[PDB]
Design a protein around this ligand. Sequence first.
Ligand SMILES: [Mg+2]
Ligand SMILES: [Mg+2]
Ligand SMILES: [Mg+2]
Ligand SMILES: [Mg+2]
Ligand SMILES: [Mg+2]
Ligand SMILES: [Mg+2]
Ligand SMILES: [Mg+2]
Ligand SMILES: [Mg+2]
Ligand SMILES: [Mg+2]
Ligand SMILES: [Mg+2]
Ligand SMILES: [Mg+2]
Ligand SMILES: [Mg+2]
Ligand SMILES: [Mg+2]
Ligand SMILES: [Mg+2]
Ligand SMILES: [Mg+2]
Ligand SMILES: [Mg+2]
Ligand SMILES: [Mg+2]
Ligand SMILES: [Mg+2]
Ligand SMILES: [Mg+2]
Ligand SMILES: [Mg+2]
Ligand SMILES: [Mg+2]
Ligand SMILES: [Mg+2]
Ligand SMILES: [Mg+2]
Ligand SMILES: [Mg+2]
Ligand SMILES: [Mg+2]
Ligand SMILES: [Mg+2]
Ligand SMILES: [Mg+2]
Lengths: 248, 214, 24
Amino acid sequence: GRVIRGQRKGAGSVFRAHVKHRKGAARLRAVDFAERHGYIKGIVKDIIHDPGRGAPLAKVVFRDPYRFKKRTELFIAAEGIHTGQFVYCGKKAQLNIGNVLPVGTMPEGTIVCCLEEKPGDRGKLARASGNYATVISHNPETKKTRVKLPSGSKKVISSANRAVVGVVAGGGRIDKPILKAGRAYHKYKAKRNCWPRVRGVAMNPVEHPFGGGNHQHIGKPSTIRRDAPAGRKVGLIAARRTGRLRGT
Amino acid sequence: VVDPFSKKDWYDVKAPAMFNIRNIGKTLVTRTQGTKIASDGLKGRVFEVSLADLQNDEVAFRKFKLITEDVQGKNCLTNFHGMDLTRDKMCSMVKKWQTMIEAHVDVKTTDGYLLRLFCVGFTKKRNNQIRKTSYAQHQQVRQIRKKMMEIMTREVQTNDLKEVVNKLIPDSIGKDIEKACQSIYPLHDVFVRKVKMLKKPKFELGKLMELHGE
Amino acid sequence: MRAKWRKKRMRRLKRKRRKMRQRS
RNA sequence: GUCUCCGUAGUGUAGGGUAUCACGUUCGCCUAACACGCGAAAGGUCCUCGGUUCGAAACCGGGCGGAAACACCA
RNA sequence: AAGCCAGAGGAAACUCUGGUGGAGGUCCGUAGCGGUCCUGACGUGCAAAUCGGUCGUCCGACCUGGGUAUAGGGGCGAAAG
RNA sequence: CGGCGGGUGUUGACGCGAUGUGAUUUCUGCCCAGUGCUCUGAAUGUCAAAGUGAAGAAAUUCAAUGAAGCGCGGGUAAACGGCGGGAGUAACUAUGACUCUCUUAAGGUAGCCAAAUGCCUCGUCAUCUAAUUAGUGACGCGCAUGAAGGAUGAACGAGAUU
RNA sequence: UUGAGCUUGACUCUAGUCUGGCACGGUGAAGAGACAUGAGAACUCUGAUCGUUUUUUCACUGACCCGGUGAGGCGGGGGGG
RNA sequence: CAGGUGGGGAGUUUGACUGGGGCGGUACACCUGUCAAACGGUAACGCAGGUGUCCUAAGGCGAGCUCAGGGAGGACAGAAA
RNA sequence: GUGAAAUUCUUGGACCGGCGCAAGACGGACCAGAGCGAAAGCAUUUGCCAAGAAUGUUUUCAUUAAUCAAGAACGAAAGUCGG
Ligand SMILES: [Mg+2]
Ligand SMILES: [Mg+2]
Ligand SMILES: [Mg+2]
Ligand SMILES: [Mg+2]
Ligand SMILES: [Mg+2]
Ligand SMILES: [Mg+2]
Ligand SMILES: [Mg+2]
Ligand SMILES: [Mg+2]
Ligand SMILES: [Mg+2]
Ligand SMILES: [Mg+2]
Ligand SMILES: [Mg+2]
Ligand SMILES: [Mg+2]
Ligand SMILES: [Mg+2]
Ligand SMILES: [Mg+2]
Ligand SMILES: [Mg+2]
Ligand SMILES: [Mg+2]
Ligand SMILES: [Mg+2]
Ligand SMILES: [Mg+2]
Ligand SMILES: [Mg+2]
Ligand SMILES: [Mg+2]
Ligand SMILES: [Mg+2]
Ligand SMILES: [Mg+2]
Ligand SMILES: [Mg+2]
Ligand SMILES: [Mg+2]
Ligand SMILES: [Mg+2]
Ligand SMILES: [Mg+2]
Ligand SMILES: [Mg+2]
């Protein structure tokens, strides 16, 4: 009879993201004439640590093509780039680590770092540390490019979508065991209020579907249908299978 | 209930002008019904046909693919797609106490056709040879392979697919490869064992019609 | 028995013996 | 204790108009012999008593047993 | 704890010995924070939850002021309704 | 409540969100019948409103058609969960390696035990005591042990016990 | 024949969700038919034209939606190379 | 607007008797014998039982017969034809 | 599919035939009482990187060598741990 945790997360009050010390939205530069027809050169002025994410951010300074001013971007650092390096963005850019160029101009096996989901927004795919997408195929007619995402899925996107060449830095961050509830606490303190996770079976029936009972048991199938009402769909949501994943 | 072959109408398959027997044969397809077009059904068919029934007096162990691009009226019109030696010929050529050299090369014609060519050659024993085996050393094999890779590219890069096909009809390429390799190790059974089309340029109908007619 | 299967039987018995001694 | 179920060849079991299956047992084959296999045979108050029915293993009551389930709050 | 120095033994791989160094949700233990036991005191109390001794932790998921946010079938909960 | 409104999200699968179990070591057995969840619609059965057709003077009635869902069919137990009986049988007895049947979706595997889980029960044997319904070790047809939880194993504990 | 907290295979509902229909809601083709002038032969059955009738497929943009930007070089053409 | 799903949420209900209540039972609507004390009535979760049906005849009328059982006889025939 | 079958897949088009696409293995025939490697082992092409035996030698050093407890490197397959 009480609103459950997870239902309370949508109101956001205590569950908003901790964005106080974050360095800004990490984005490619907006597409313009230089991107669309040639290339523009920028210099990697810094590489910084953004709180809450494991990927380093690259502070890159470009020249404004229309007025006397310096434009600073916050690219996601592809691994291997360094400060004092020139990075080139546009259609006529060459294949080098850190360059930004449309996928349609890239060969049939290249892999990319900050891919655009739509032709013109900034980078949206393969942004988390150590991740990359792969350019599988092209067709010049219909101007489509098929790519492979970090989840293993295949997606058809416009050939005009830009991406950074290389893998995003931050390496195999998930290899190291956390080893400590304190380290987990410090990890999630920079992200959001989610970490100390109470099992639903350890709750009372009023605040969870799984709560209650003299023994800590679920008491009902933990797989729950997709169209279950909020406050009920807890557990394995619309699971196609359960078990051990033997074979794939 | 009715047999579907009542709704099939026959077409004549036509080979390009490189072969003096133009009639490959006949094919069939179901008549056009709804969105299903008999032209679309007939397009993209491959006709593995020998060379002895395409050219008047050529050898019989050579087969051509001859894919169909365009159909007009009651004629399907084909174009070169690849060639291959026959299974029995290829198996008879392989023998013990001898070394075979195999080479492959990807090469683009002048008109935009990309071809993968596979050539084989076999070491030949001399007439007075007493030794049982005829084996080439590894450097000789490497030089022969390099030679027969570099005298397949210059017969393809500098000419059109039409005069590539008409010169691989008698296997002039294999003959000159065998002649060239005699200063390294003698070879006897040298053929362009296979060629396969890898990419095609956009299907110019004028080019197809000059291949078939004039 | 086959010598290999006597070896296997001995190995099973030795694991059981190690478990029994470790229990003390 | 209250409630429910069961009782059929030697064994485990099926099932209102002459009781099935399998193993077991017997006999004859095959084998030097046993087993296997092959061909036949025997075997059961259907727990006891009463009643309904033309006819009860069945259907209905009573009794013998046997087997489950409840046997709580102070 | 790693890192470092020196001596010694080794064919090497490296090993041994003595220092140095100062890590750790490390140990004893103040302040702080907490509240185990006496089932102590008190139980018309000092107190509508306190006091004494004994205790747990005491560089960390640590303690704490102020400013903000979340409001009733709602909030918030390392979870005791 | 509402706005193409808002949180995750200054985010993008090494990420968010939802669960269970709970370091390490060693393992995690069998069951998809049931209930869930999910995949595929294949001729498909049922299937509302609207729409189509017919009869009627109309209200109306009838018929055809056939969305999801449910049925039909696969997958899934680190989903919820579940994991048997009755007889005979070894040259002393005793047990039963072994053999018959009935039956299940599968018949509890590896382990562990009168354990915080065993009624009978203060179980039986050993040890500890002069004497022990206590403790430990061992046994196991275990009323009613058991595998994402089982069995262990240092360090630790204002935890329970001798 | 008074409640409340909680559960569900109780009864009766309900937010939300899945699906169908109608409206916003257009423009071209291509199919297959029912379309309607019609035509072959009351003398007995076949080719058409524009609209309309459905259902499908493809295409367009102009409603509607999304993204980027300080709405900064878009589309077509002409030079000059 | 229509159908499905929908303890996520809402509202409500969850009989009675009873040697306390629950479990059991139905003594909750009926019928026979007894209790019952020679009119009638008369109680316990008093005793022994029965009922939620069945029958175009097992209803109606008329006619004609005599039933259970036993004894004695009769080919097969026997305890029973 | 087998000795024969059956479990299994099939008017939902299974098998078969054709054209494509994807993935991961595997490198036939040539392949030999042939080669190389300390053994284990090593076989598609091409390139790079070091290494090596044998041969040739009127080169150089001049005994620097052989086998070797302890110790060290590699060590099929199976098995174990992480991705
Ligand atoms: Mg937890
Ligand atoms: Mg609790
Ligand atoms: Mg609930
Ligand atoms: Mg529960
Ligand atoms: Mg349960
Ligand atoms: Mg400490
Ligand atoms: Mg301490
Ligand atoms: Mg006190
Ligand atoms: Mg409680
Ligand atoms: Mg966890
Ligand atoms: Mg349907
Ligand atoms: Mg399975
Ligand atoms: Mg066991
Ligand atoms: Mg036990
Ligand atoms: Mg105990
Ligand atoms: Mg004592
Ligand atoms: Mg014990
Ligand atoms: Mg399991
Ligand atoms: Mg009342
Ligand atoms: Mg109420
Ligand atoms: Mg129901
Ligand atoms: Mg309710
Ligand atoms: Mg009287
Ligand atoms: Mg009277
Ligand atoms: Mg009379
Ligand atoms: Mg190995
Ligand atoms: Mg592994």
